[PDB]
Design a protein around this ligand. Structure first.
Ligand code: GSH
Ligand code: GSH
Lengths: 183, 183
């Protein structure tokens, strides 16, 4: 089965949410970041940058939460996809991991970036229940996890963006979310 | 041919570098960020977040520099790849766009993060000429572009990381780099 390397209160919870959505068994391998386990040779052989999450799937190892999400989504796919279909998913995963996370969580750019990001997401989410349309996908795990951390880590809310607020509420209420990030 | 939406001194030059490495033609379209052209309706219809770069490949549009690099690499591939081969490239692109760029360019985390990132890259680059081994790849465009910006924006050098220094020196001297980022 997949082995997920993580620690409490890290982005490993985002991978646990997607594994819950996919109903896939996995082994959770705790890495003791407080005592520096991630900086020793055994963990550096899994991720040479000493960060969690990472996964092992047999002899295959992979790190970066976004790449893990794309990998699990590809492995679970039942209909073969082309470079353009994968590209639109990759676009949103890169967005969640860079443009969105940076604009919300970097204090020096937050005042300018955060309202613009939320205003753009309000337009998208006001026209469809999920980012890619009518159906929930790995894109909602990637983007939704970052938005869900806003009340958690910044004590801020989405009161001025009702469609974003309803979207995040809908995600937090999902049983798979409550079993992982929401636990 | 691909249309590339970009602007001076932006990550659009990273896409131009990879297009030149692939010997592909492209129609470059300047978006006047200084005059707010990226916030007008025509550009928001391409990237709703108003950021460059973006591409159009016929009717298909795509934004996030990382997603564009992965898309161009997939389209130019002659040997069909599976989920694991794509995952390894996805890992490095996500790393360049998040972990690496943040650890080097965010002042509050640079002191702790930068030496760890450079020490890990130094070990990899001391063993092979490029990140994935003997051959130059899209990963070298993604990671190498970020490393090449360090002297430019931080007034720092790679004197204590000789393999990183020689790797960056080699990339900057590439004709395709000179025709794009170095132009
Ligand atoms: N862009 C990476 C970031 C991973 C990351 O920063 N992980 C943290 C915990 S959430 C970590 O392992 N920190 C340990 C350290 O930096 O020493 C991802 O999304 O996977
Ligand atoms: N993660 C995005 C970042 C794109 C980005 O920040 N682009 C900048 C120029 S380098 C931009 O268009 N800024 C305009 C604005 O923020 O209003 C990517 O890699 O494409």
């Amino acid at each position: 089965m997949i082995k997920l390397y993580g620690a409490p209160q890290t982005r490993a919870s985002i991978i646990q949410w997607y594994l819950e959505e996919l109903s896939l068994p996995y082994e959770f391998v705790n890495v003791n970041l407080k005592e520096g386990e991630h900086r020793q040779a055994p963990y550096l052989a899994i991720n040479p940058f000493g960060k969690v999450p990472a996964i092992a799937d047999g002899n295959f190892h992979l790190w970066e939460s976004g790449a893990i999400l794309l990998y699990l989504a590809e492995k679970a796919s039942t209909i073969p996809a082309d470079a353009q279909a994968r590209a639109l998913v990759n676009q949103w995963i890169l967005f969640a991991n860079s443009t969105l996370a940076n604009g919300l969580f970097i204090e020096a750019v937050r005042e300018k970036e955060m309202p613009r990001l939320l205003q753009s997401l309000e337009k998208i989410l006001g026209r469809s229940p999920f980012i890619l349309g009518e159906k929930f996908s790995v894109v909602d795990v990637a983007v939704g996890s970052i938005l869900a951390y806003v009340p958690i880590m910044l004590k801020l809310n989405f009161d001025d963006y009702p469609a974003v607020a309803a979207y995040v509420q809908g995600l937090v209420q999902r049983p798979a979310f409550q079993a992982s990030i929401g636990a």
